[PDB]
Amino acid sequence: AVEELCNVAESLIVPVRMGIARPTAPFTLASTSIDAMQGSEELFSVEPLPPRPSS
Amino acid sequence: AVEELCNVAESLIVPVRMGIARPTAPFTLASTSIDAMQGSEELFSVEPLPPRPSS
């Protein structure tokens, strides 16, 4: 778990220290877990892109 | 001259590739030599900070 967390942290920090961060508008932070569940629900409960029908 | 230009270029490019560039506002580019002489004149015709009088 510690090794995987190290890799995740490196993935998150590389664009910041290479100056290639993609601009994003500011957002507020949820003060309750019921709001934090949403947003994450939209992000994760998604389906892959379906294949092209026929050919 | 080539070596000094290399050092100047490195000085100019380090903040960009370390993600520490100081935000600035957009500006137009002069199309005349006199305008380019201006601005540069304000930049280079300055004086060093004088010492504190007495003690």
Side-chain angles (χ1 to χ4, degrees):
Chain A
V2 59
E3 307 178 4
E4 297 319 291
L5 283 178
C6 290
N7 291 264
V8 170
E10 175 261 287
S11 66
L12 286 170
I13 195 59
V14 154
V16 175
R17 72 173 196 254
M18 289 213 294
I20 51 183
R22 168 184 176 270
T24 308
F27 62 99
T28 181
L29 306 183
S31 301
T32 54
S33 179
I34 186 176
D35 190 15
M37 178 182 178
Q38 197 67 210
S40 63
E41 203 278 339
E42 301 291 340
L43 176 59
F44 285 135
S45 68
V46 80
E47 296 185 358
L49 192 66
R52 181 175 296 262
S54 300
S55 179
Chain B
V2 180
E3 309 178 359
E4 297 320 292
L5 282 178
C6 291
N7 291 263
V8 171
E10 175 261 284
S11 65
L12 287 168
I13 197 58
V14 157
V16 177
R17 73 177 201 255
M18 296 190 76
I20 50 185
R22 169 184 177 269
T24 55
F27 61 97
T28 179
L29 306 183
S31 301
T32 56
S33 180
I34 175 178
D35 192 8
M37 177 181 178
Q38 200 71 12
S40 64
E41 191 274 343
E42 307 291 338
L43 176 58
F44 288 114
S45 304
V46 294
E47 303 287 342
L49 194 68
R52 178 160 293 185
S54 300
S55 180

